[PDB]
Structures are given as C-alpha cells and as structure tokens.
Amino acid sequence: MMQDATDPAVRAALQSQPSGLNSTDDWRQVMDRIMSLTARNPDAFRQQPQANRLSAILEAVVPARANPTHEKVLAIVNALAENRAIRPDEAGLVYDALLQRVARYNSGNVQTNLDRLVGDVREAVAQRERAQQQGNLGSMVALNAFLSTQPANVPRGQEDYTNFVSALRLMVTETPQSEVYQSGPDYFFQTSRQGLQTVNLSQAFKNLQGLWGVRAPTGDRATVSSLLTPNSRLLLLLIAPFTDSGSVSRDTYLGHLLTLYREAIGQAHVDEHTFQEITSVSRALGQEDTGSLEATLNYLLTN
Amino acid sequence: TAVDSITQKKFLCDRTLWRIPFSSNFMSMGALTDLGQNLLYANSAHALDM
C-alpha cells in the first residue's frame, strides 16, 4: 500500500504547529493524560517534576488561544508548491506577500472564504494528482482536434478504417500516463514513453488514405506496399498492442501487416522470458553470452 | 639553632566565585534546583536579608 501526494495542508501544518502536546487543541488528550486516565501508565503525571506538572494544568484547564493563521496561509502556499502554482524557490515571497495582503485586510469577509478555499485548494492537489496519472485530459481534447481536422469515414477505395477510428481512441483510454497527443507543429503526433523514443506523426498516417484497400499478392512483403513510410510503420506497430481483430487480414496490409505486427510482439515477450534466464545463469556459463541475442536473431531470420 | 614557634596557617583562593546551590539537598542538579521552585519558594513573596 502507498500514499497520495503528502497532504499539502498537512505538510505546512507539520512544519508550523506543535508536535507533542498542544494543550488547547488536544485539550481532552492532555486532560486525559493529567487526570491519570491514560492506559499506558496512569501516574505519568505524578512522577513528573512539580513545575512542568503545573505548566500542564494552567494550559489545559484554562485553554490558551494559539496562533492558527500561519498554518492556514502556509497551507495554501505549500499546496501552491504541490499543485505547482509557484516554484519551490518562490516560498519566501508568496508566503509573506499574501500575509502582507491579509495584514491590510485581516478583517473582511475574505479570510472566512480563505479557510473554505484552504479545503478547496488542498482538494485541488488531490484531484489533479489522480488526474495527472490519467493524462487523458491533455490527450482526448487533442484527439478531438485530430478527428475534426482529418476527414473521417472517407475510404471510397475499400473500407477497413471504421475499425481504426476506435483503435486510436483505445490508445487514449488504455495507457494514459505519458501518452500525450502533442500539437506542437500542425501535424499531430503521439508520444508513448516518458523519454519519447517512438513519437511519429499521425499526419504521416495521411499516406494510408490511398492504401485503405488494395490487392494482396502473396505472403511475402508486397510488390506495392513498399511505399509505407517507417514513420507510418512506427504508428502501426504502436497501435498493435491495442487492436488486432477487425481490419481484414487478407485484403490489404491494414490487417495482414497488423497481424504481422503481433508476430513482432509475439517473438519479443517470448525472447524476454528467454533472455531473463540465460543472463541469470551466468555462474555456470562464465562468459559474455551474446548467443542469447544471436539465438534471438536466429529465431527471427531462419523461419 | 633550635628556636620556638607557633605557626600561622591560611588559605589562598582567587579567581572563582563562592557558589552555593538552592535545594534542601544543597546540590545543583540541572538548572532549576529543588528549592528554586518547590512548595515554599515558588509564587509567594520573600525578602533576603544578610
């Protein structure tokens, strides 16, 4: 089990308010401790020195108003650090700039809002932290711009593309984390990893609009399908762990190559379980076994 | 040369303060000693003579 982002209203409380005994806030906890009612040891208040004994009585029986503002205003500014509304080095300015703002306006209806906004801003950290795990929000809106600009449902050659419409939508829903459909240049493009080692254009996909339905030769790479760019080829291998059945595997490469993209993944996860064993058995071989990779090469070439 | 005498013994003692603690034990244990904040010397008013 794991925690959510360390509670932003509590992190700032951790650094300000008393830890052990706040005699006013934890009143019936000190009162329980002084009445010899605590289950740990009853006479923990009796065996204590007489002077600090009296300090517990004066503070608990007469509750003293402790300063609450600096654990409320800091609760906003540290949430401003976790929601990233300010930079971490900005904690010197905004903490006091708003304290100087409430120095001028201590006593309007604004601070009655402020503590209600404290509960709102602390929840906004918890809302966004669960929302950044699903980076769908900066992805689906971007795909809405892709679906509108690109002409949808126009394969007047042959139609297998209706299945492909949902295939791109499945990539948004299944993996959301680093999967951002960034619109930097006017061509749309999707990143798969946190460092973006396969971020091809979804407008390199515009090469497929004339190749949505053509004739198939035989079983070896086609006499025509050499036109398919390694840019668009990178996309079609990336949608392959998402959609398989739907596109016709016998009419054009939209389906025949998509089934063949599963052959690339099908070998990969087998060889993953192959490599994790031969590398693990290095005590009995005592060599840099590149034959683990050479057999992997042999299991792809000699078929 | 045997002569007769009665000695005078005396102590020298400089550069330290004459320190005495404030407890019924009369031994400084900590900063605040027993009689420092006891039952008799705590909140009431008293005036030191010499």
Side-chain angles (χ1 to χ4, degrees):
Chain A
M1 47 87 78
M2 283 180 78
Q3 287 183 306
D4 205 289
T6 318
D7 207 289
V10 184
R11 161 180 243 112
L14 200 79
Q15 299 184 314
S16 60
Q17 78 175 315
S19 188
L21 299 159
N22 200 323
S23 53
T24 307
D25 193 64
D26 303 61
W27 145 78
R28 214 190 175 186
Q29 289 174 59
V30 177
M31 204 62 72
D32 206 292
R33 208 156 172 263
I34 66 161
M35 258 83 261
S36 76
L37 201 77
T38 314
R40 320 273 184 178
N41 276 308
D43 289 298
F45 192 58
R46 186 176 164 259
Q47 287 190 296
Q48 269 193 307
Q50 204 186 283
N52 73 281
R53 199 182 185 180
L54 193 80
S55 80
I57 310 155
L58 294 157
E59 275 263 51
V61 183
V62 180
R65 294 176 185 177
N67 204 265
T69 323
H70 295 285
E71 67 203 69
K72 286 163 184 182
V73 72
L74 198 75
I76 311 152
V77 85
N78 217 327
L80 256 67
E82 300 302 302
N83 259 331
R84 273 133 199 169
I86 56 148
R87 287 193 177 187
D89 63 297
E90 282 255 284
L93 293 154
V94 200
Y95 140 85
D96 197 67
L98 225 149
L99 265 168
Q100 208 161 301
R101 196 90 237 111
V102 300
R104 305 186 193 178
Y105 300 98
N106 256 309
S107 63
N109 300 303
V110 295
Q111 211 180 113
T112 320
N113 279 297
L114 256 92
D115 287 14
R116 247 198 162 190
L117 329 185
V118 164
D120 196 283
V121 175
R122 76 171 186 182
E123 201 185 300
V125 181
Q127 198 185 305
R128 194 63 200 173
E129 217 77 54
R130 291 173 185 178
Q132 210 197 303
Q133 285 180 55
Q134 278 191 54
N136 205 292
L137 294 159
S139 296
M140 199 183 78
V141 186
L143 188 127
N144 284 309
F146 175 74
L147 208 141
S148 60
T149 317
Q150 188 90 248
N153 199 250
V154 211
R156 281 179 178 177
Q158 314 295 307
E159 189 171 298
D160 309 313
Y161 176 68
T162 322
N163 190 64
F164 203 89
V165 178
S166 60
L168 291 157
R169 281 191 175 185
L170 282 155
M171 282 197 82
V172 204
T173 323
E174 284 186 62
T175 320
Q177 198 195 316
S178 183
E179 302 263 23
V180 191
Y181 292 72
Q182 292 163 331
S183 185
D186 278 297
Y187 302 147
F188 286 91
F189 57 94
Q190 193 193 358
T191 172
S192 188
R193 330 274 183 182
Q194 203 194 61
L196 356 155
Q197 27 155 311
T198 32
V199 193
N200 70 0
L201 312 162
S202 298
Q203 213 72 33
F205 173 73
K206 212 176 182 179
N207 292 302
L208 285 84
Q209 78 164 59
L211 293 155
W212 278 326
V214 286
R215 298 287 160 194
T218 353
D220 265 318
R221 217 160 202 148
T223 180
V224 193
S225 192
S226 187
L227 196 79
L228 197 78
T229 324
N231 216 199
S232 60
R233 186 182 180 182
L234 210 72
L235 182 77
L236 292 156
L237 82 92
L238 272 163
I239 77 107
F242 294 87
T243 320
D244 309 308
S245 59
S247 188
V248 184
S249 184
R250 230 260 193 159
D251 180 310
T252 191
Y253 284 85
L254 271 174
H256 194 92
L257 251 167
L258 254 188
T259 320
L260 280 163
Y261 283 124
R262 264 206 82 171
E263 303 292 303
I265 309 154
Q267 286 287 306
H269 209 58
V270 168
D271 291 320
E272 167 76 284
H273 295 127
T274 315
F275 197 84
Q276 265 208 248
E277 298 293 297
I278 319 154
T279 294
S280 186
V281 183
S282 59
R283 203 252 171 199
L285 255 174
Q287 273 280 309
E288 288 178 63
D289 269 70
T290 50
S292 308
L293 286 153
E294 283 188 62
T296 305
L297 218 302
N298 281 307
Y299 268 89
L300 282 154
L301 190 79
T302 58
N303 288 311
Chain B
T1 178
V3 197
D4 300 298
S5 166
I6 302 154
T7 185
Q8 190 195 300
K9 49 195 172 187
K10 197 191 170 180
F11 75 103
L12 167 87
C13 156
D14 55 282
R15 185 189 194 185
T16 174
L17 289 150
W18 288 138
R19 49 184 161 189
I20 31 174
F22 206 88
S23 49
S24 299
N25 181 21
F26 297 93
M27 190 167 74
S28 69
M29 194 161 73
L32 293 161
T33 344
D34 276 284
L35 281 180
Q37 201 164 21
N38 216 308
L39 186 79
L40 194 67
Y41 317 95
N43 283 292
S44 298
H46 302 279
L48 205 87
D49 278 61
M50 220 78 78

